[PDB]
């Protein structure tokens, strides 16, 4: 109900205007969920992003209330942070930390990453993922698109928009959210999912990295999930072109059954991981990536 959404998120947001503790107003996007814009916090000088929302035109709000909950109880280095937020009548501001280095996604289809750059951004996603999957929340839509880098080769999770709060009582879900070339396949086969779907979406972000795009991105999305269901752990076009502790990272990722994949804690240790380059070696990918758009 609307009435209740409006004074819900009264409660949670700071009051009044946001061009009071902001001034550099740049647009960068364009609704869809809301206009982007880039901004500084006047005070401190920090560089941020922020969402602008009509809310009568917002068709699932209890979904941001959850978001800004979420994110604002789950502040992380490998997250793309939750910083403030204004409503000023039915127009709701959302201030999110802004990264300048664009999306994963730029990365792996402009460039070629190396092993050893790669073995460095699954270990950040894998990290934003355990801290997250620790507090008994599912991010539910990882992929490429959802990573965001800085211009230092940081690296960190995004959009929050279709996450998951679990609790012991009900420590799975049914809802198929995500996108589809990312999804595990237990929530197409089954109706009930865990954490250890972003472990699966994460596999595929590597495959992503590898091949520049997720298995069967070329069908439609309907028969994406068919394929996915049906043909489990997929294949990679050149395995032999990867070291054998990569493909071995892969196949804990991609695992079939649930209880054989590994969770974010474990695939931490992993031995692939500890190729990782210094994430400074992402910089000239992202600079080409940039430049290409």
């Given at each position: 109900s609307d009435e209740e959404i409006l004074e819900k998120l009264r409660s949670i947001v700071s009051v009044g205007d946001p061009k009071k503790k902001y001034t550099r107003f740049e647009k960068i996007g364009q609704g869809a969920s809301g206009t982007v814009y880039t901004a500084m916090?006047?005070?401190?000088?920090q560089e941020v992003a922020i969402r602008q929302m009509n809310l009568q035109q917002q068709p699932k709000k209890e979904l941001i209330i959850n978001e800004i909950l979420v994110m604002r109880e789950n502040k992380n280095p490998n997250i793309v942070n939750y910083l403030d937020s204004y409503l000023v009548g039915d127009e709701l501001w959302v201030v999110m930390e802004y990264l300048?280095?664009?999306?994963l996604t730029d990365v792996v289809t402009e460039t070629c990453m190396d092993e050893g750059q790669i073995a460095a951004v699954c270990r950040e996603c894998l990290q934003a993922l355990e801290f997250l999957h620790s507090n008994?929340?599912?991010?539910?839509?990882?992929?490429?698109?959802n990573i965001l880098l800085g211009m230092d080769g940081s690296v960190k999770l995004t959009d929050?928009?279709?996450?998951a709060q679990i609790?012991?009582?009900?420590?799975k879900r049914s809802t198929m959210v995500g996108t589809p070339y990312w999804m595990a396949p237990e929530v197409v086969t089954r109706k009930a999912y865990g954490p250890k779907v972003d472990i699966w979406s994460l596999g595929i972000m590597a495959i992503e990295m590898i091949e520049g795009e997720p298995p069967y991105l070329n069908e439609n999305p309907l028969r994406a999930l068919y394929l996915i269901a049906t043909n489990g752990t997929p294949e990679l076009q050149n395995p032999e072109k990867l070291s054998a502790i990569f493909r071995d990272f892969l196949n804990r990722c991609l695992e079939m059954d649930v209880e054989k994949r590994g969770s974010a804690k474990e695939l931490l240790?992993?031995?692939?991981?500890?190729?990782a380059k210094p994430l400074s070696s992402l910089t000239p990918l992202i600079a080409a990536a940039k430049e290409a758009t």
């Amino acid at each position: 109900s609307d009435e209740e959404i409006l004074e819900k998120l009264r409660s949670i947001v700071s009051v009044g205007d946001p061009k009071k503790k902001y001034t550099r107003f740049e647009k960068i996007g364009q609704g869809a969920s809301g206009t982007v814009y880039t901004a500084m916090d006047v005070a401190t000088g920090q560089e941020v992003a922020i969402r602008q929302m009509n809310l009568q035109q917002q068709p699932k709000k209890e979904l941001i209330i959850n978001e800004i909950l979420v994110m604002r109880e789950n502040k992380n280095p490998n997250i793309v942070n939750y910083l403030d937020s204004y409503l000023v009548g039915d127009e709701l501001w959302v201030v999110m930390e802004y990264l300048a280095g664009g999306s994963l996604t730029d990365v792996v289809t402009e460039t070629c990453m190396d092993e050893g750059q790669i073995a460095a951004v699954c270990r950040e996603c894998l990290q934003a993922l355990e801290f997250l999957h620790s507090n008994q929340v599912i991010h539910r839509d990882i992929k490429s698109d959802n990573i965001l880098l800085g211009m230092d080769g940081s690296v960190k999770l995004t959009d929050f928009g279709f996450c998951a709060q679990i609790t012991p009582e009900q420590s799975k879900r049914s809802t198929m959210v995500g996108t589809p070339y990312w999804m595990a396949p237990e929530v197409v086969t089954r109706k009930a999912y865990g954490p250890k779907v972003d472990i699966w979406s994460l596999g595929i972000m590597a495959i992503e990295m590898i091949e520049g795009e997720p298995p069967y991105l070329n069908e439609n999305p309907l028969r994406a999930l068919y394929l996915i269901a049906t043909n489990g752990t997929p294949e990679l076009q050149n395995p032999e072109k990867l070291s054998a502790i990569f493909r071995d990272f892969l196949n804990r990722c991609l695992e079939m059954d649930v209880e054989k994949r590994g969770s974010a804690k474990e695939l931490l240790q992993h031995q692939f991981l500890k190729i990782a380059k210094p994430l400074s070696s992402l910089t000239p990918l992202i600079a080409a990536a940039k430049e290409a758009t």
